[PDB]
Design a protein around this ligand. Structure first.
Ligand SMILES: CCCCCCCCCCCCCCCCCC(=O)OC[C@H](CO[C@@H]1O[C@H](CO[C@H]2O[C@H](CO)[C@H](O)[C@H](O)[C@H]2O)[C@H](O)[C@H](O)[C@H]1O)OC(=O)CCCCCCCCCCCCCCCCC
Ligand SMILES: CCCCCCCCCCCCCCCCCC(=O)OC[C@H](CO[C@@H]1O[C@H](CO[C@H]2O[C@H](CO)[C@H](O)[C@H](O)[C@H]2O)[C@H](O)[C@H](O)[C@H]1O)OC(=O)CCCCCCCCCCCCCCCCC
Ligand code: CLA
Ligand code: CLA
Ligand code: CLA
Ligand code: CLA
Ligand SMILES: CCCCCCCCCCCCCCCC(=O)OC[C@H](COP(=O)(O)OC[C@@H](O)CO)OC(=O)CCCCCCCCCCCCCCC
Ligand SMILES: CC1=C(/C=C/C(C)=C/C=C/C(C)=C/C=C/C=C(C)/C=C/C=C(C)/C=C/C2=C(C)CCCC2(C)C)C(C)(C)CCC1
Ligand SMILES: CC1=C(/C=C/C(C)=C/C=C/C(C)=C/C=C/C=C(C)/C=C/C=C(C)/C=C/C2=C(C)CCCC2(C)C)C(C)(C)CCC1
Ligand SMILES: CC1=C(/C=C/C(C)=C/C=C/C(C)=C/C=C/C=C(C)/C=C/C=C(C)/C=C/C2=C(C)CCCC2(C)C)C(C)(C)CCC1
Ligand SMILES: CC1=C(/C=C/C(C)=C/C=C/C(C)=C/C=C/C=C(C)/C=C/C=C(C)/C=C/C2=C(C)CCCC2(C)C)C(C)(C)CCC1
Ligand code: OEY
Ligand SMILES: [Cl-]
Ligand SMILES: [Cl-]
Ligand SMILES: [Fe+2]
Lengths: 36, 451, 62, 34, 341, 334, 37, 82, 30
């Protein structure tokens, strides 16, 4: 219990949400719903 | 624990930069490194714009803010604002970006390795916030460096190639300025103009002669204040009027910056001289005037007599009088009759727009510009659909003028808030009650009741 | 020298990229103030040198 | 010495696992062309 | 110990998430309102009920997704999955709008469960239940807007759809058809919500800027012990400040915090009343005296007549697409329009 | 001492029933002028040609308005942003016709209110208080600057500033949505979270403190008499309110530091209203709400409408009717 | 476009302007490291 | 105090945690992906694909107009698409 | 192409967390 430093999981998790969110903003311009 | 934690420094992590108030060398690293990010951004962004630049498209159709600043200084551009050589942009971009690395190096050095405080290493670079002599001396050096920079602009305009001049004949051109304006009646007349419609304070400066001249004055003014403060110390009246603390000086500059950001916001919105519409797109007034012109032109070609056309309200459909009687475009654009631009001024007579010049002298280049500008009005949506809010998707456009004015309103506003925060706090901290009220001597408890 | 220009320019990037991670680790490790003084000083001149070299090459391919 | 399965445990999984599954669903949608 | 009492013990155990008896109503209904919203905004259309896309699947974004109301032809059907419309067919349920009633009705019972939860926890901990009382205001809003209003109208079609832009649509419908801004019951609700925000901000700022110095650090948050006996800020200096800034001030801490409950709770209640009125088209739409004058005097104009002209524009330009089941056909020439635009 | 010092000491006296202060020296005259003009114009002012088309709008009670329809009408579009003091008119009659009272009221009022904010700082200094109440007030003040100054600047006319009336406010909001799709702007959505959340947290804090009042009274007297002004001690049990609220949600979704809790109550509405004031201020420069009109289309290319398209049909109804005689050309560019 | 020489550097040039925001995020990774002391 | 359970800071720094959740999380994600990529979501929920909003030549909308005939109304519109 | 960009930002962005990582191992002076 506590073998992985909390700051590491945080950064990892964070970069993970940034990716998914970034992907959704990409989708606003590509394909369905891009007006194109 | 060299400061650096909430126990020794008294400031929590979320206000940890307040830990640097009395650590001049670490504070010097923070600033230099921060300057690094600024210069970095000027470099990285300009190259981004270059890689994305297509010289056939108007600059303002391509999301560009920095390249238009370079073009206005006379690099890379020719008549009509046509881009004729992109290499100067590349140079600005690379030189700032290289430079950021040395700022970068210098800031991270001073912030980590260097001496946390300077005042024991050299009595010249170290400082106490409360040394009124040392504080004015730093002010004076920086004053001189600003005066120099103002004069760099004069050098460019007069000795190193000139400036883009939207009012230059033949639709604009780069141009050397040889008769800067020095009459102080003009230069300082601008400062006494009302900021209200038709006057516009210093935002109304509409020729490069006034611009270059004002920068001569300001350069020489700063250099002279620099010397002043380097040699003097604050007088009795000024000592008693200000708070002398690092936070107080911070609040004073947040003040200044906020006021400047608001002025910037109106400059880019109304001024089409140092923000040429060739590069930035039309002003809001300009586009609105341009539409009236377009439909005057069209209807006149069909055979309409545009001077006698009574619109539905009883006011002229194309032409009416301003409240001081000038002939001006009709319809809603009646609010924008103060607009002045190179495409429109040739139709102007002494009493305003001139119907004979309207009937006879409109060239195709004016019909083109007016049509271009009306269809690049600075209206668009946050996701860059161009046009009014009811427009369908298709046009991917938001005016550089909207981007720059909105960003700097927001920035100027929050910087006034910062001013109030840090000025109030500085006052509180100088009097010793920023941390709260003393239960043992609560001031109100010693005051008579209001009733 | 269309290929000797990229050799220098990747040198800048690969070196920049090194010294970006390397200078701040160096600075805040207590161990080797002296095992690394030389290091950063050499990359430094190497970096500057490279900027110049890439700066003059440009003018034969730009 | 703690339990591992608890009411709390059930609470977080009733949310988290549909949430992840929905996120992959939505991810895939970004690549649908018309 | 009876089995009821053993079940009671376990349901009222001190755990990370208190359950309770009310939990048996709250957790299932809340989970399913939520889950049905997420499910429908992610995957379900509004094509057969509205002529609209409404899910991520179809390419909507978080602003334009909705679980949309059922078609007008369904009346006020409960739209039970096993009912006569969908006949147990889940896919057809979704297509006809079942998720809307599903969310609406589970949400209703979940709000019930939450309030009982507020009652249940207050009783066990031993405090007065003023929080539960406060929660009556959200409940009145929800019932009035989502249930009562459509029950007075022709069907569930005209209730709010569960989506960001769908609600914006509802705001503008209410302007163009009900002239809701003119309604004194909304006006009062506005006063209560903006007044509550005002109270929120001014009480927070007043406390934060009258603190006593109770530690020696610059971060003042660490100088407070929840078990201390003393007020952490000065009522006396707060009082003087506002007496001389604004003329009057609070002097009674209990009155001040009761006033904070009252103002917003009372505002939402008044808004609920007006929507009940609008369930019946009992609008405050017009001022008869202005209309008599205006009809007679073509030079009489006020902001009230200007606004009606806008209402008239909203109704005609938006109804054909907004109420597709009516097959409104408006030739260009009947559309009201000012000059040029 | 000498006369100027007696005066300075009076101005800054913490013993005046109402604090004057140096900011008060500007605030008092400017608010008085704004208030007297507004009250007289609201009752008696004759119709004002707001849009510059010789189509005067009656805003005052004596010319056929009631409390809800009446207004002080914005100055003429013919004026745009020109300064129109009384002395610039050829007669009061001309000044009333073109909407001069509006300029006078809002300039004196923005000045007065800007100084009201400074006054809040000033008194907190004389009292030994911390200084940032005035920061909280900057949110409402910023909002007033937006509808009365910034939006007219961007659009080029005070005729598009907010009218000083109940119905006039509605007019301004409907036209705004039409021209900027403010509902679809995140700064306005942040404003709604601000004020909704402020109302919520307002009811919560009040409910939660009221829930945990210490029995200090009988059933026949008001609970309020259990608190005495200036009492050393607290009259509610914050630990019990945490015990209730921590269980209502979970233990760490609840505040147990009175200072952290009150800072949160301050920051939530202030920040949100900062954003919605900045929203009006940036839509002033036509950076408008998200535009998703015809954003979904099918394999062939038919437009598949969304709720955003339905909003757009309402917006279009506002667009084509507003100021119905004021446009001669097809685009309404400001 | 950049000078064709620097074309291979186009996608790096694409990402560079976002770099100053990483600095703000790096400060939070740092305080997480030192546990917001 | 503590209501008894295992502190979160403790679980998510635990290795056993990430052993378990290095698998379950990505797996759930892929399950959702497949739900859309297989085209399954369309048929479960009755959501039109980009090619099934209209018949090739129609411009009117398959709006349901009857309360009890409604299931039949939708099914007959789905015939005319082919 | 876009992987060119994503490999650059991938590399640039992890550059930061790493400096923290190294200085932690080295019982550096964070
Ligand atoms: C401490 C200091 C205290 C000072 C207090 C006393 C100051 C009073 C000044 C009032 C300012 C408000 C009026 C501004 C209205 C306006 O027309 O201001 C705009 C004017 C620009 O004026 C325009 O300038 C134009 C100049 O362009 C002309 O010339 C151009 C030349 O290129 C073009 O050719 C163009 O076509 C042509 O028209 C014309 O003159 C226009 O008609 C004219 O309207 O800007 C300006 O003077 C620049 C500055 C504008 C004011 C800054 C905005 C302040 C926002 C307040 C923030 C609130 C903060 C929140 C508080 C909480
Ligand atoms: C407070 C906190 C409380 C917490 C709330 C907890 C949530 C509980 C859940 C609420 C359940 C609501 C279901 C309501 C269903 C309903 O009404 O459904 C409506 C049906 C009536 O059906 C409607 O009937 C209409 C009239 O038809 C009649 O008229 C026609 C003549 O044109 C024909 O003759 C037709 O055959 C004939 O039926 C139309 O046909 C509509 O299309 C059809 O929906 O009534 C019925 O189910 C029952 C009607 C009897 C009254 C039921 C009381 C509840 C209703 C409250 C109404 C008060 C509000 C009125 C404001 C207005
Ligand atoms: C960054 C620029 C800067 C800054 C921060 C300062 C800061 C300071 N100056 Mg220096 N100064 C500067 C530039 C600057 N100066 C330059 C360029 C010059 C040469 C022009 C001078 C010349 C100068 C002199 C001659 C003196 C100072 C003094 C001072 C101190 C008092 C300032 C004061 O009272 O403010 C202003 C505060 C006031 C209360 C003045 C009130 C007057 C009104 C309200 C302000 C507007 C006056 C302005 C001149 C006209 C307005 C134009 C309008 C149309 C917009 C302070 C340390 C004083 C000092 O102690 O010197 C040692 C002093 O006597 N400065
Ligand atoms: C412009 C942004 C900026 C800048 C320049 C600074 C700068 C500084 N901060 Mg502040 N800070 C900021 C944002 C910023 N901060 C924000 C947003 C927060 C909130 C999360 C804080 C919170 C904060 C706290 C809590 C504290 C500081 C402290 C400090 C100082 C000591 C740094 C230290 O000990 O780090 C040590 C850390 C390391 C050695 C880790 C590595 C850091 C290096 C610099 C990475 C550089 C990367 C870069 C790519 C290098 C390569 C380029 C090169 C080739 C040129 C320093 C002057 C400290 C202080 O006051 O000291 C007494 C302190 O205690 N700051
Ligand atoms: C005053 C500063 C300023 C201004 C006016 C602009 C303006 C612009 N930029 Mg630039 N930019 C800036 C700072 C600025 N940027 C900074 C700091 C970065 C580094 C992160 C960039 C990086 C950048 C890139 C990489 C690109 C632009 C692009 C653009 C254009 C489109 C912007 C857009 O879609 O916004 C979208 C709006 C938002 C994301 C809203 C952000 C506002 C936040 C969420 C709220 C406000 C926060 C704070 C309180 C203020 C526009 C001309 C684009 C372009 O057209 O290139 C030619 C492009 O691709 N910019
Ligand atoms: C605001 C800028 C600034 C200031 C005031 C200082 C001040 C100081 N630094 Mg730092 N430093 C800076 C920036 C700054 N530094 C930058 C950018 C770097 C990276 C290049 C460094 C790297 C650095 C190191 C590595 C060391 C110092 C040291 C010192 C101390 C002695 C330096 C000295 O006298 O040099 C002598 C000065 C000269 C020989 C005069 C020439 C200076 C330059 C070449 C003039 C050019 C000015 C230029 C035209 C201005 C325009 C800039 C831009 C707009 C283009 C002193 C406390 C030393 C220290 O603290 O002791 C341990 C030390 O070891 N500095
Ligand atoms: C303040 C703003 C509020 C947001 C909370 C911020 C939490 C952050 C906080 O302050 O402390 C974090 C808190 C502490 O957890 P541990 O004690 O495990 O961690 C100790 C560590 O902090 C040591 O470093 O953990 C949480 O409570 C996790 C919340 C997950 C809760 C799961 C919720 C699922 C249940 C459904 C929701 C409840 C139902 C309600 C009624 C129906
Ligand atoms: C202190 C500190 C901090 C901060 C930091 C900073 C702010 C820094 C800065 C930094 C910097 C400021 C740096 C810089 C860098 C730079 C670089 C590294 C550059 C390089 C360049 C190059 C290499 C180039 C190249 C090229 C060319 C030449 C051409 C085109 C292409 C290209 C672009 C590629 C933090 C907050 C984190 C934390 C605490 C402490
Ligand atoms: C460049 C140019 C130009 C020119 C410019 C100029 C020449 C400038 C000037 C400037 C100036 C010359 C400015 C001024 C400033 C001022 C100020 C801004 C002031 C302030 C003040 C204050 C801040 C005060 C306060 C106070 C008091 C009152 C009392 C006690 C306390 C105290 C101290 C706080 C022109 C336009 C032509 C053109 C374009 C370009
Ligand atoms: C120019 C150039 C260069 C340079 C670059 C640089 C200068 C870089 C930097 C970089 C950086 C500067 C980085 C940074 C990074 C960052 C990060 C990635 C962060 C993130 C974060 C996160 C994700 C967060 C999370 C969290 C925490 C930790 C705590 C609390 C919570 C939260 C969630 C907030 C090179 C060499 C390439 C060469 C070419 C050109
Ligand atoms: C309906 C129904 C049902 C149920 C269902 C359910 C129960 C569901 C669930 C569901 C769920 C439960 C889901 C969830 C999902 C979630 C999501 C979808 C999330 C996402 C999110 C996000 C995306 C966010 C992010 C972010 C942002 C955006 C910003 C800030 C930051 C953050 C990171 C937070 C049943 C069976 C009875 C059958 C019938 C019908
Ligand atoms: O929105 Mn429509 O746009 Ca701003 O101007 Mn052109 O019309 Mn008129 O005067 Mn008031 O209002
Ligand atoms: Cl109108
Ligand atoms: Cl017009
Ligand atoms: Fe309180």
């Amino acid at each position: 219990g506590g073998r992985i430093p909390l700051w590491i999981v945080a950064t990892v998790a964070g970069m993970g949400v940034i990716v998914i969110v970034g992907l959704f903003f990409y989708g606003a311009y590509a394909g369905l719903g891009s007006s194109l | 624990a060299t400061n650096r934690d909430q126990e020794s420094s008294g400031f929590a992590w979320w206000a940890g930069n307040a830990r640097l108030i009395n650590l001049s060398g670490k504070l010097l690293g923070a600033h230099v490194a921060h300057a690094g990010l600024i210069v970095f951004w000027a470099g990285a962004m300009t190259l981004f714009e270059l890689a994305h630049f297509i010289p056939e498209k108007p600059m303002y159709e391509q999301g560009l803010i920095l390249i238009p600043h370079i073009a206005t200084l006379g690099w890379g551009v020719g008549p009509g604002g046509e881009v004729v050589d992109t290499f100067p942009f590349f140079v600005v971009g690379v030189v700032h970006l290289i430079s950021s690395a040395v700022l970068g190096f210098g800031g991270v050095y001073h912030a980590i390795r260097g001496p946390e405080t300077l005042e024991e290493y050299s009595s010249f670079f170290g400082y106490d916030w409360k040394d009124k002599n040392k504080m004015t001396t730093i002010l004076g050096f920086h004053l001189i460096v600003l005066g120099i920079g103002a004069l760099l602009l004069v050098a460019k305009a007069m000795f190193f190639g000139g400036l883009y001049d939207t009012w230059a004949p033949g639709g604009g051109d780069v141009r050397v300025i040889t008769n800067p304006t020095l009459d102080p009646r003009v230069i300082f007349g601008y400062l006494l103009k009302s900021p209200f419609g038709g006057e516009g304070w210093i935002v109304s400066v509409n020729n490069l002669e006034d611009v270059v001249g004002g920068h001569i004055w300001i350069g020489l003014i700063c250099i002279a204040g620099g010397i002043w403060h380097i040699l003097t110390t604050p007088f009795g009246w000024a000592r008693r009027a200000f708070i002398w603390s690092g936070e107080a000086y911070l609040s004073y500059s947040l003040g200044a910056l906020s006021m400047m950001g608001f002025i910037a916001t109106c400059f880019v919105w109304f001024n089409n001289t140092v923000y040429p519409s060739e590069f930035y797109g039309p002003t809001g007034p300009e586009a609105s005037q341009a539409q009236a012109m377009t439909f005057l032109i069209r209807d006149q070609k069909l055979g309409a007599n545009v001077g006698s056309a009574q619109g539905p309200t009883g006011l002229g459909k194309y032409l009416m009088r301003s409240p001081t009687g000038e002939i001006i475009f009709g319809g809603e654009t009646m609010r924008f009759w103060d607009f002045r631009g190179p495409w429109l001024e040739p139709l102007r007579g002494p009493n305003g727009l001139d119907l004979n010049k309207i009937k006879n002298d409109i060239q195709p280049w004016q019909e083109r510009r007016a049509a271009e500008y009306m269809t690049h009005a600075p209206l668009g949506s946050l996701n860059s659909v161009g046009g009014v809010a009811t427009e369908i998707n298709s046009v991917n456009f938001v005016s550089p003028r909207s981007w720059l004015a909105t960003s700097h309103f927001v920035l100027a506003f929050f910087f006034l808030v910062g001013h109030l925060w840090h000025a109030g706090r500085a006052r509180a901290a100088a009097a010793g009650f920023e941390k709260g009220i003393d239960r043992e001597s609560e001031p109100v408890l010693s005051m008579p009741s209001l009733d | 020298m269309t290929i000797l220009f990229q050799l220098a320019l990747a040198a800048l990037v690969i070196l920049s990229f090194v010294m970006v991670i390397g200078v701040p680790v160096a600075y805040a490790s207590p161990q080797d103030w002296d095992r690394s003084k030389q290091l950063i000083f050499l990359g430094s001149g190497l970096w500057i040198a490279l900027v110049l070299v890439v700066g003059v090459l440009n003018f034969f391919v730009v | 010495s703690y339990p591992i399965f608890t009411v709390r445990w059930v609470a977080v999984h009733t949310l988290a696992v549909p949430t992840i599954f929905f996120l992959g669903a939505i991810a895939a949608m970004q690549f649908i062309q018309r | 110990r009876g089995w009821f009492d053993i079940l009671d013990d376990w349901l009222k155990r001190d755990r990370f998430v208190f359950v309770g008896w009310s939990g048996i109503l709250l957790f299932p209904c809340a989970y399913l309102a939520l889950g049905g919203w997420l499910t429908g905004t992610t995957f379900v259309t509004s094509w057969y009920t509205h002529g609209l896309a409404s899910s991520y699947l179809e390419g909507c974004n978080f602003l334009t997704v909705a679980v949309s109301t059922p078609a007008n032809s369904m009346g006020h059907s409960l739209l039970l999955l096993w009912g006569p419309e969908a006949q147990g067919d889940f896919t057809r349920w979704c297509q006809l709008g079942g998720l809307w009633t599903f969310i609406a009705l589970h949400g209703a019972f979940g709000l019930i469960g939450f309030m009982l939860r507020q009652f249940e926890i207050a009783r066990l901990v031993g405090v007065r239940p003023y929080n539960a009382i406060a929660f009556s205001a959200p409940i009145a809003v929800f019932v009035s807007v989502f249930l009562i209003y459509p029950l007075g109208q022709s069907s569930w079609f005209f209730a709010p759809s569960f989506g960001v832009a769908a609600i914006f649509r509802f705001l503008l419908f209410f302007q163009g058809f009900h002239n809701w801004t003119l309604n004194p019951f909304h006006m009062m609700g506005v006063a209560g919500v903006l007044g509550g925000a005002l109270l929120c901000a001014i009480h927070g700022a007043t406390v934060e800027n009258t603190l006593f110095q109770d530690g020696e650090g610059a971060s003042t948050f660490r100088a407070f012990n929840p078990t201390q006996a003393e007020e952490t800020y000065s009522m006396v200096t707060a009082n003087r400040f506002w007496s001389q800034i604004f003329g009057i001030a609070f002097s009674n801490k209990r009155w001040l915090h009761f006033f904070m409950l009252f103002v917003p709770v009372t505002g939402l209640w008044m808004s609920a009343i007006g929507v009940v009125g609008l369930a019946l088209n009992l609008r405050s739409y017009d001022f008869i005296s202005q209309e008599i004058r205006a009809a007679e005097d073509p030079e009489f104009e006020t902001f009230y007549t200007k606004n009606l002209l806008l209402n008239e524009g909203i109704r005609a330009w938006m109804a054909p697409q907004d109420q597709p089941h009516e097959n409104f056909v408006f030739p260009e020439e009947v559309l009201p329009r000012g000059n040029a635009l | 001492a000498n006369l100027w010092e007696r005066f300075c000491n009076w101005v800054t006296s913490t013993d005046n029933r109402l604090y004057v202060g140096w900011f008060g020296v500007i605030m008092i005259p400017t608010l008085l002028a704004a208030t007297i003009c507004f009250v007289i114009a609201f009752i008696a002012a004759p119709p004002v040609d707001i849009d510059g088309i010789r189509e005067p709008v009656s805003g005052s009670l004596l010319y056929g308005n009631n409390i809800i329809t009446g207004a002080v009408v914005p100055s003429s579009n013919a004026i745009g942003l020109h300064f129109y003091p009384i002395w610039e008119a050829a007669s009061l009659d001309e000044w009333l016709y073109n909407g001069g009272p509006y300029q006078l009221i809002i300039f004196h009022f923005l000045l007065g209110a800007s100084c009201y904010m400074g006054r809040q700082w000033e008194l907190s200094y004389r009292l030994g208080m911390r200084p940032w109440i005035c920061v909280a007030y900057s949110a409402p003040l910023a909002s007033a600057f937006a509808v009365f100054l910034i939006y007219p600047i961007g659009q080029g006319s005070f005729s598009d500033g907010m009218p000083l009336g109940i119905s006039g406010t509605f007019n301004f909001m409907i036209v705004f949505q039409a021209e900027h799709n403010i509902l679809m702007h995140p700064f306005h959505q942040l404003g709604v979270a601000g004020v909704f959340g402020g109302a919520l947290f307002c009811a919560m804090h009040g409910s939660l403190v009221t829930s945990s009042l210490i029995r200090e009274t009988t059933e026949t007297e008001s609970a309020n008499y259990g608190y005495k002004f200036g009492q050393e001690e607290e009259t509610y049990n914050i630990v019990a309110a945490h015990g209730y609220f921590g269980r209502l949600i979970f233990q760490y979704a609840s505040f147990n530091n009175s200072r952290s809790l009150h800072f949160f109550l301050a920051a939530w509405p202030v920040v949100g209203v900062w954003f919605t004031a900045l929203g009006i201020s940036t839509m002033a420069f036509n950076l408008n709400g998200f535009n998703f009109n015809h954003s979904v289309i099918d394999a062939k290319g038919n437009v598949i409408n969304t709720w955003a398209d339905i909003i757009n049909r309402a917006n279009l109804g506002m667009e084509v009717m507003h100021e119905r005689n004021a446009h001669n050309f097809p685009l309404d560019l400001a | 476009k950049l000078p064709e020489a620097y074309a291979i550097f186009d996608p790096l040039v694409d990402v560079l302007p976002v770099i100053p925001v990483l600095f703000l995020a790096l400060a939070f990774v740092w305080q997480a490291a030192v546990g917001f002391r | 105090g503590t209501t008894g359970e295992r502190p979160f800071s403790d679980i998510i720094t635990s290795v056993r945690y990430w052993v378990i959740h290095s698998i379950t999380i990505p797996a759930l994600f892929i399950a959702g992906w497949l739900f859309v990529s297989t085209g399954l979501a369309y048929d479960v929920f009755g959501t039109p694909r980009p090619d099934s909003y209209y018949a090739q030549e129609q411009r009117s909308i398959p709006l349901v107009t009857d309360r009890f005939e409604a299931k039949q109304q939708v099914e007959t519109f789905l015939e005319q698409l082919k | 192409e876009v992987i060119a960009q994503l490999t650059m930002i991938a590399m640039i962005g992890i550059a930061g967390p790493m400096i923290i990582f190294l200085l932690a191992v080295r019982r550096g002076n964070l």
